[PDB]
Amino acid sequence: VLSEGEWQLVLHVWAKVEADVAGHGQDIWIRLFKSHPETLEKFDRFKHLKTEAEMKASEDLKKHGVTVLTALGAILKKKGHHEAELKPLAQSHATKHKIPIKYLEFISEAIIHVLHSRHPGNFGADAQGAMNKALELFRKDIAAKYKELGYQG
């Protein structure tokens, strides 16, 4: 359970992400797909992208990053009370997309790397720690839901 102070560190850096959610999403995808290429294979719609240039030029990939980060943002703003938000997410990711917890760890790593890079003003050690704590809570709760839905994760 995160403290209010920790949630504020998470929300303060997210406020910067919201200045340009599309741009942050693009950097996050490039970071993820380059660090862990296997994660790209899960996207039937984007698995043909061969280079960073192609990824950056993809309007649909950009749009999907907006969708993903906006959904994550809504979860973070709930400050732990995200039961309603996790239900549909866990169901599609467990049953349809089949995304292991390990891949959620990969994207969490990508998110943190991008925030560390773009936002040193609001992503110092304490802020990164709070963001990690928030993402671990997210994955923990998703893992529990995966279990209830019958997916090993």
Ligand code: HEM
């Ligand atoms: C921060 C974690 C994540 C969030 C908030 C998230 C969010 C979303 C949202 C909101 C959608 C659209 C609605 C839906 O299908 O549920 C979606 C679709 C999808 N997600 Fe995720 N996702 C996350 C991580 C991942 C990861 C790590 C992978 C893959 C390695 C993944 C693969 C997919 C796929 C395959 C789709 C469908 C893409 C398409 O429209 O063709 N997601 N995700």
Ligand SMILES: OC[C@H]1O[C@H](O[C@H]2O[C@H](CO)[C@@H](O)[C@H](O)[C@H]2O)[C@H](O)[C@@H](O)[C@@H]1O
């Ligand atoms: O922070 C690094 C550790 O990250 C992962 O573990 C955290 O998140 C898991 C959920 O994704 C939890 O089960 C674990 O308890 C958390 O510490 C990774 O699995 C660990 O190997 C890393 O050390």
